[PDB]
Design a protein around this ligand. Structure first.
Ligand SMILES: O=P(O)(O)OC[C@@H](O)[C@H]1O[C@](O)(CO)[C@@H](O)[C@@H]1O
Length: 318
């Protein structure tokens, strides 16, 4: 018994299902507030002297790793860690399971095929470099590196894929086609689905759900190769309900806690627990051209600040 307060950074449906399922299982009064991973980091940091939640569930790992480095988290290694894909068992900058990995999300883009026809573009873009086509001017959205974890994952991915120089050259040539840098990582999926933009860049599972729900979207794992987020779970330093936060980490890393995300929580990420059944709509990492994402390097405060700063100077303001 007792209570649990969650800062959730997954989609609302996923958060609500996790909270409800956890409360039903353990008889713990559980609540959550949802913000993206970027805006959750900012709030946890701001509240450091009097923390307002017990656990941070979901959202890109980099800001969780950064919070770990900054002393905002409380280490706890669940026994369920042994079931997690080994390379994702303790992937953050500061080791000791201040953060753990609960899912994988593939970076890519999706194309609204109905709107594409209106643009007079015959071929569905298949490569990152296809997004620099002037015919796509004002027809692409991605989240804002200044605010969004998804957008940071994108920058870090490009830097690792092509080297930093080429990554920023790409951003420079993508930039003229971006109609809006969104505050939320998921807004480009919403907008692409509804035909308000033609191409959304973000994590493919979000576009996959919109597609299965009827949106005219073609998902693209870009031809050059791509990267991914890990979704994180982390207990906050100063958690008022520490035992329940640990139980929740166990749940988050468990076979049934992960399976429920797609079975009931309408969230189609790939699961990190090797004993869990995957959604038939989840991406299979073994089939994809993926970098080896260095969370130790990119999940650090200096590097995150540096790259975001460089983006503002070189892409937004240059
Ligand atoms: O708004 P930002 O700051 O980008 O944060 C949102 C993301 O961290 C999370 O959003 C999702 O893509 C939702 O399915 C998750 O898979 C992903 O972890």
């Amino acid at each position: 018994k007792g209570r649990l307060v969650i800062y959730c950074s997954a989609t609302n449906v996923m958060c609500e299902n996790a909270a409800k399922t956890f409360e039903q299982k353990y008889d713990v009064k559980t609540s959550f507030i949802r913000n993206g991973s970027g805006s959750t980091f900012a709030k946890i940091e701001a509240e450091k002297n009097n923390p307002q939640a017990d656990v941070w569930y979901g959202g890109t790992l980099d800001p969780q790793s950064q919070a770990g480095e900054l002393g905002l988290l409380e280490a706890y290694r669940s026994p369920n860690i042994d079931q997690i894909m080994p390379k994702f068992q303790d992937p953050a900058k500061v080791k000791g399971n201040l953060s753990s990995a609960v899912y994988i999300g593939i970076l890519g883009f999706a194309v609204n095929t109905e709107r594409l026809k209106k643009l007079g573009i015959e071929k569905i873009p298949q490569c990152w470099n296809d997004l620099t086509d002037p015919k796509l001017k004002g027809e692409i959205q991605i989240a804002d590196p200044q605010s969004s974890g998804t957008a940071y994952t994108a920058i870090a991915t490009f830097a690792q894929l092509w080297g930093e120089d080429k990554a920023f050259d790409y951003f420079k040539h993508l930039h003229p086609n971006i109609s809006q840098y969104t505050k939320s990582g998921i807004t480009p999926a919403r907008n692409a689905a509804r035909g308000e933009t033609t191409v959304g860049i973000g994590f493919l599972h979000d576009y996959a759900l919109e597609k299965e729900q009827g949106a005219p979207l073609e998902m693209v794992v870009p031809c050059e190769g791509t990267g991914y987020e890990l979704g994180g779970v982390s207990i906050l330093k100063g958690a008022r309900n520490l035992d329940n936060a640990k139980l929740f980490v166990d749940f988050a890393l468990s076979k049934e806690g992960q399976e429920t995300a797609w079975k009931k929580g309408q969230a189609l990420q790939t699961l990190t627990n090797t004993t869990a059944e995957q959604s038939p709509l989840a991406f299979d990492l073994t089939k994809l051209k993926l970098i080896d994402y260095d969370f130790e390097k990119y999940g650090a405060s200096d590097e995150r600040k540096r790259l975001i700063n460089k983006w503002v100077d070189e892409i937004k303001l240059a």
